[PDB]
Ligand binder design. Structure first.
Ligand SMILES: Cc1cccc(NC(=O)N2CCC[C@H](C(N)=O)C2)c1
Ligand SMILES: [Zn+2]
Length: 139
């Protein structure tokens, strides 16, 4: 679990979004596994605007932060689940590192701020949904 709170927005994995999130929907994209909902309180997370390929992510299944080199956002095939059929998830970045399903929502950060959130994993790999291109989260 986990979310990004920036201004009046909450960013979560679309597969983990609650009834509240859907009832206060701003934007959702199944192909990215992202959903943004409106909030009443202020969010102070800073979103990174960059092309960094190194950062640190939070891994709840280990209660630890790990440094990673990750790939540029791209279309990567994702195996079927109780949330989605087999498909290409876009805006996805992979890194070598530990992850388990409950790790989704853990934040990936670089020196410039929040980069994305854990969305996929398996076989010694961890996949992050990029949020750096969503420039509207700041205005
Ligand atoms: C982080 C992690 C580790 C091991 C396994 C998983 N499950 C995973 O990748 N799935 C199921 C949940 C929805 C994901 C998706 N974005 O389509 C696909 C996650
Ligand atoms: Zn950066």
């Amino acid at each position: 679990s986990g979310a990004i709170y920036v201004g009046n927005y909450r960013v979560v994995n679309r597969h983990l979004a609650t009834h509240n999130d859907w009832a206060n929907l701003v934007w959702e994209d199944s192909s990215r596994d992202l959903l943004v909902s409106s909030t009443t309180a202020q969010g102070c997370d800073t979103i990174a605007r960059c092309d960094c390929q190194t950062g640190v992510y939070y891994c709840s299944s280990r209660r630890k932060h790990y440094p990673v080199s990750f790939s540029k956002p791209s279309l990567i095939f994702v195996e079927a689940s109780e949330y989605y059929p087999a498909r290409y998830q876009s805006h996805l970045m992979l890194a070598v590192g530990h992850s388990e399903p409950g790790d989704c929502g853990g934040i990936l950060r670089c020196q410039h701020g929040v980069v994305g959130i854990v969305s996929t994993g398996g076989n010694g790999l961890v996949g992050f949904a990029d949020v750096r291109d969503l420039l509207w989260l700041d205005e």
